[PDB]
Amino acid sequence: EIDYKDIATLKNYITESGKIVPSRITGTRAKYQRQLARAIKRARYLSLLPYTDRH
Amino acid sequence: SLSTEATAKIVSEFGRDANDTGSTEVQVALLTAQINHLQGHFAEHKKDHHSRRGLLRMVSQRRKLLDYLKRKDVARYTQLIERLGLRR
Amino acid sequence: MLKAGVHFGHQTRYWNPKMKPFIFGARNKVHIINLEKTVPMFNEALAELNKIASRKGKILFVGTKRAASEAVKDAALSCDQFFVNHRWLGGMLTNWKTVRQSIKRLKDLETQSQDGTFDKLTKKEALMRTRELEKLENSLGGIKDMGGLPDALFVIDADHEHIAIKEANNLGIPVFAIVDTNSDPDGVDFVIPGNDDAIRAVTLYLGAVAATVREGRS
């Protein structure tokens, strides 16, 4: 959310597969769903999080 | 988009005091300043059409202002175009 | 000045803009009417009501909703006044001459309920013709005897009485109505602000109308 390093908070905004969870489920606000995804994206690149559950 | 440092500078170089921000000359001057800076931005790139639109915008504005001045104080006009270095 | 123990106002969003001048509400996402404006409208309400009621009151207490209906089959019903307390058969004012025969049937039937033919025919026909009666009975009570043309009309909830008011508006029948915050006024010549569907504002002004038609010239 407020940051990608927080993989802690994060891991509960992604499905098992690692797909970013729709806001209609997280029930999250708008502005933040973006800050969220952006930080998730950010965290996948630094291998702090999977893209895929195939690993 | 021009440095608060640099924009201020020019306000204190063309107006009564700083704060005299809206003084004709001052506008005409910090437009000029950007217009010129920018000419290198668009020196590279050139395909940055969109940004170019603001730059054209800049020119046509400063142009209108320059015009109005000449209409009012033709003195402050000549002084300005000399000292801003344009109108050839 | 108030009397209304509790009709205060009523009705929340659904407000009809034109009902501004009779509202000062705001409590908990619903507006309270102008408590002190409903009142100077009993001045004129019951006044030109009783005013025509002495010169001879023939009213028509039009009001419906399976939860307020029968509470009009009273001193509203009884005294110098007539009533409709069910689905307002459209055109019953406007087709009065068609429906006029829907009366002849009602009578020519009950006038033959405990009268005339009855316990004869089949033990089918029986309540298998009082299914006819019970029907025409409600919706077409206050019609029965008309005697003196419908002359003003007292109507309960202006918009929920879309038709009957409109009918009147057409026929020159002054329409006295109470109009919630949500209901559309101006169809009403004599407009009565305030709640329209709480068991009180009804009986109150309702019974209070009966209580001024009922007496005006001794």
């Binding site: 940051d3 390093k5 996948r44 690149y45 630094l46 999080l49 999977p50 690993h55 | - | -």
Partner: protein
């Protein structure tokens, strides 16, 4: 002078280069009179997916305030140095401390 996160991650085998690397970057940035507001040698962390063959690799966090210029001549060195399997330099918006 602007800020950046920066969080290059190095190759296990070249682990004991990480101290010299940090010494070096700090030197370079400090020399430009730019400060340095956080530093975290997370060491050998386990990878989510197995980037570049090899799982688990040595992370290092930074947080610096330096002129868009030395930050420029950083990703270069970050490229040159095939011991750094990824890097990333980020936003800014004023300094930072602890978290993580």
């Amino acid at each position: 002078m602007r800020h950046y996160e920066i969080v290059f991650m190095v190759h296990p085998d070249q682990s004991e280069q990480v101290p010299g690397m940090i010494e070096r970057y700090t030197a370079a940035i400090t020399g430009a009179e730019g400060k340095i507001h956080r530093l975290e040698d997370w060491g050998r962390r386990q990878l989510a997916y197995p980037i570049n063959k090899l799982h688990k690799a040595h992370y290092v966090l930074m947080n610096v305030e330096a002129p868009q210029e030395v930050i420029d001549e950083l990703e270069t060195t970050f490229r040159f140095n095939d011991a750094v399997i990824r890097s990333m330099v980020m936003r800014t918006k004023h300094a930072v401390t602890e978290a993580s």
